Structures are given as structure tokens and as C-alpha cells.
Amino acid sequence: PGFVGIRFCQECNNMLYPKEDKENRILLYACRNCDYQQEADNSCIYVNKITHEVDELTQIIADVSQDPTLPRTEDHPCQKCGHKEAVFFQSHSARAEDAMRLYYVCTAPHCGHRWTE
Template identity: 25%
Template sequence: MEFCPTCGNMLQYELPHMGRPSRFFCPTCPYVCHIETKVKIKKKQRLVKKELEPVITEDDMKNASHTDATCPRCGHGRAAYVQFQTRSADEPATTFYTCLNETCRNKWRDD
């Protein structure tokens, strides 16, 4: 949406007609803004993917409690777990597990 710099009303769009380019015009005052048919890209900027910090770090899992939970990937019977309240207070906490098998280290969660 574009607005008239003179009176502040919303500009209306008019299609090109008989050699005249398309334009925005103000219905209440004589303001007219012609639209260029070609768009010029002045600068290309590469987006850099930001590195995400994990919510649960390896140090958190080293200090976590252990339980008899079966890993869905390797079937190991022990896992470290941490619980967080990820939803509203009347919902149960979410449990995040890490397999204690040194070759697996699979992470999963139980809602």
C-alpha cells in the first residue's frame, strides 16, 4: 500500500494505457507517481545461516539423572534425562533423553 505524501490518502493503481506507464494516483489531489517497468537490484546480499545454540548442552546431560529407558535406535537400556516445562503449566513436562551407549548417543523426547 502506498499513501499520498501530500494529503495522506491511499493511492490507487492505474493500468498502463496508450503508451502511458502504469501509475499510482491520488483520488483527492493531483499527486501522481509513475511506476518503472524494470526493477533494478542494487545489491545482492548472501544470507549467512546462523549457528544455533542447543537448548540442552552436553554438560546438562552429563549432570542429568539416569533412568531405565530403552533407546529407540540401538535398544540400549539406560538413558540420561532432563525435564522441562515446554507447554502451559497444566500440561505435563517434556522429558528429553540421551542414550548412554557411547557409540549411539541418540537424543529423543517424550511429551
């Protein structure tokens, strides 16, 4: 389903807007401040997840591993590097639909592995 973000006009770094080519029947991108025509390569213009399932795992950051106020368990060894010590916590994201799932970060520098079980 993808997620279409912003694209910028190379000539002035202003936001591009899509426009149908009514002669050759192709999708192009345009700028209101510049006569810059460039060809689209996605064919999708707008998307919106209404249920809005989103991967909290990705927004986890390896730096949380050093948080002193976080619970620690060697009962869940790291899946990547095998280091025993893991910090675990809940999603911490508001708008979480309905969940208490745990997310684990390895307590080893430069491993920085974040995983879910």
C-alpha cells in the first residue's frame, strides 16, 4: 500500500504537485512557482491508513538501552548478538489501538538491536 511523502522541485526546492498530462495521458509533477515539468514514477498520489496499524518497533531507538529507569532481564537473550541483558518496555506510543506488547532493546553498545516477541 505504500506511503507517498513530499517531493520537491529541483529548480526552486518548492513542493511538487501532481498533474495529469491530457495529451499523452501520463502523470507529471509540477510547481506553481516554476514551469518545471517532471515525470512521476509511482502512479499513486495520496494514501490514508484508517485502521492505522503502525510498526512501533521501528521507532524504538538503540539509545534507550542505557536508560537507568528501565527494567532489565537476562531471561530474554538478544536474538541478534546473543547478549543476555535486554531492557523491555511497552509501546509507549499514544493512540496505540489496544496493546500491552513488549519491545526489547539489547544492552550492548553498537549492537543496538530492537526486537519484539
